[PDB]
Design a protein around this ligand. Structure first.
Ligand code: ANP
Ligand code: MG
Ligand code: ZN
Lengths: 398, 256
């Protein structure tokens, strides 16, 4: 339907509209935001997982009959969709390179989109230097991590987007979470992270499978590891606080809705307790490694690398992942697997990890047999998309 | 300047190699920074303690401090900013190269050793101007795909993946890194890929090149150790330190 533009102009008039956009965390932030606001305001209109273009958005308003809508919107669609919709609130999760790919082009798309509703507030991730790069017409509030600071340090040399947008010197960090996010500061000019309106002030307990943290004087717990879930939680809590929802209602809503983060993917092979983790890019893989580094037990590590259509043919990205972390982990033994068993074993040897404890397997079946016969009770498996499907499929045959 | 990477302090080594990872925090794309990890791996196998320093914008470069310079590729914006800093390192890099010290330069790093490169949109970015090659642009077209080259000076075959708009032309005082068996190489007019000039090795190869070609990794490190400690030293053989990588290496039988 070309006339989807006419349905939106019509049906969207009678809603207070929140738009969630950015590179990553759009779906999870939207879902948790909907869960929390429901506790305060009852039924909330929202789009299915990933249905974040003109069609998915139009269909969402078509299923509904002074109400709130929280919509995930594809960055590229936003400038168009906001000539039809007039959102009251924009949430910016983050801005990172499309990996296939210019960050300031995808950024200009969401700046243009919000510019079309110049009175709407933007709630942005203050930890992203991109979100302080431009004079913005809309009113802006910022959320981020306001935990203990250290002296300015460079981010890891493989980090993207670390040039000062004002003076073209290299930014440093008094706190770095992942990628280019944190308490950024230019040592050459005045540019630095703005004062945060919404503050994660303490990390209480961060484990391989959970996190507890304080946002604006209240405690939250999620039953999944990894920093990116803490940002998605921070963003959703910030929206609820902007909407004036009470601390007691945010907690009740948070606890009922946090299952939308899912759980780590756990199963057993014989008497071994196993966790399977999808890897597809340098920042993601590096964050998986930092998470499993927190495990309070010895484990085997299996890395399964395929290069099929659905994985991406390119495996050069493993060289940018922080596999050097494996020398600072309680790892008993390493299995190198997938079709590219040879390249991933070479990538792990080059860390300086004992090469007598790195073993290639030509068949995923042999990885499973090796894990069943291993001494350590725990096994972690990091796999590309197709390696993960074949691995789950072989487990299903037992 | 800071140290990004260091061999373990508690292991013994008879040699010491220091690597300048030139703009390593700005020219950091396409896994090309993997070349640093391959040099460290091969150097340690040969009995060298490795120190890698990130020598980036506004950092002084002293040629006497380094045994290998690695200059990789980056995005167009980061490469334009690096180009503004280059004049500050020109004298020391010219002297480094003139002394037959080892450089590996990939994509943008290879282009920026030369006179200039031109972006797709026609904007000319001046390079160090220390070597005579230059890079023209292509308005719309890119060279993309698998490539294989053969260096006749060393009788070595290199494999990789190219993805560049740049069309590089070598000056009369340079050699190619190799002659194209299949793929585009520098410009699709001659059969040249990369550059070999003194102990400068340049390429458009992603891989990273030293992961896919341990013959070249071995060559760069042994060359650096023999420049530092003299040509009479005896290093472990290719076959003894890299037997497994040699056995598993991708190679094919295509001719041209
Ligand atoms: N805050 C975050 N920062 C970085 N990566 C994240 C973040 N949240 C999620 N991710 C990653 O992105 C994946 C998709 O999460 P999701 O919330 O669906 O993101 P999205 O913006 O909707 N993008 P996508 O579904 O992949 O088009 C997750 O499985 C993580 O791998
Ligand atoms: Mg999504
Ligand atoms: Zn600055």
């Amino acid at each position: 339907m070309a006339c989807d533009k006419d349905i939106l102009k019509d049906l969207s008039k009678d809603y207070d509209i929140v738009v969630v956009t950015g590179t990553n965390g759009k779906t999870l932030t939207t879902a948790l935001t909907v869960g929390i606001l429901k506790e305060a305001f009852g039924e909330i209109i929202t789009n299915p997982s990933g249905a974040n273009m003109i069609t998915g958005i139009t269909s969402t308003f078509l299923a509904a009959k002074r109400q709130i809508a929280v919509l995930e919107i594809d960055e590229a669609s936003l400038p168009r969709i906001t000539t039809y919709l007039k959102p009251s609130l924009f949430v910016y999760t983050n801005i990172f390179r499309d990996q296939m790919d210019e960050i300031y082009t995808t950024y200009q798309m969401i700046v243009d989109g919000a510019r079309n509703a110049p009175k709407a507030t933007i709630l942005a991730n203050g930890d992203s230097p991109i979100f302080s790069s431009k004079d913005i017409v809309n009113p802006v509030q910022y959320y981020g991590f306001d935990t203990a600071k250290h002296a300015p340090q460079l981010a890891h040399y493989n980090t993207e987007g670390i040039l000062c947008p004002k003076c073209e010197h290299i930014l440093q960090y008094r706190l770095n979470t992942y990628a280019n996010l944190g308490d950024f500061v230019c040592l050459n000019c005045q540019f630095q992270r703005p004062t945060l309106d919404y503050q994660l002030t303490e990390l209480t307990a961060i484990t391989h499978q959970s996190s507890e943290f304080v946002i604006d004087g209240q405690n939250y717990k999620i039953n999944v590891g990894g920093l990116y879930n803490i940002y998605n939680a921070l963003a959703a809590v910030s929206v609820a606080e902007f909407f004036g929802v009470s601390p007691e209602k945010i907690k009740a809503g948070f606890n009922k809705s946090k299952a939308v983060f899912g759980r780590q993917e756990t199963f057993t092979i014989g008497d071994k307790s196993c966790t399977l983790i999808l890897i597809k890019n340098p920042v993601g893989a590096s964050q998986a490694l930092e998470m499993i580094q927190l495990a309070d037990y010895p484990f085997s590590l299996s890395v399964l690398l395929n290069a099929n259509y659905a994985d991406g043919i390119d495996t050069s990205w493993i060289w940018d992942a922080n596999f050097e972390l494996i020398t600072q982990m309680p790892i008993t033994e390493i299995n190198a697997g997938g079709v590219r068993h040879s390249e991933i074993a070479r990538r792990l040897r080059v860390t300086g990890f004992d090469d007598t404890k790195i073993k290639q397997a030509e068949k995923l079946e042999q990885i499973i047999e090796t894990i069943e016969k291993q001494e350590a009770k725990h096994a972690y498996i990091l796999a590309t998309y197709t390696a993960m499907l074949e691995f789950r499929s072989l487990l299903a045959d037992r | 300047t800071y140290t990004s990477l260091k061999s373990p302090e508690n292991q013994d080594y008879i040699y010491d190699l220091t690597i300048a990872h030139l703009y390593g925090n700005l020219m950091n794309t396409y896994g090309d920074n993997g070349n640093i990890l391959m040099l460290k791996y091969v150097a340690e196998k040969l009995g060298a303690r490795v120190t890698v320093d990130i020598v980036s914008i506004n950092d002084t470069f002293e040629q006497d401090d380094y045994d290998i310079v690695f200059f990789g590729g980056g995005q167009d914006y980061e490469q334009s900013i690096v180009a503004k800093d280059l004049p500050s390192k020109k004298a020391a890099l010219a002297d480094y190269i003139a002394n037959n010290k080892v450089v590996l330069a990939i994509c943008g790093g290879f282009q920026l050793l030369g006179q200039y490169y031109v972006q797709a949109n026609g904007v000319k970015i001046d390079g160090l101007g220390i070597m005579g090659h230059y890079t023209l642009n292509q308005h719309q077209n890119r060279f993309i795909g698998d490539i294989k080259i053969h260096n006749d000076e060393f009788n070595e075959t290199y494999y990789g993946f190219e993805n560049h708009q740049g069309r590089t032309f070598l000056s009369g005082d340079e050699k190619p890194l190799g002659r194209v068996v299949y793929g585009n190489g520098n410009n699709k007019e001659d059969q040249t890929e990369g550059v070999h000039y003194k102990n400068v090795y340049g390429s458009y190869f992603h891989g990273p090149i030293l992961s896919r070609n341990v013959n070249l990794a071995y060559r760069l490190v042994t060359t650096a150790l023999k420049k530092k400690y003299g040509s009479a030293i005896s290093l472990s053989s290719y076959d003894d330190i890299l037997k497994q990588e040699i056995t598993e290496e991708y190679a094919d039988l295509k001719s041209k």
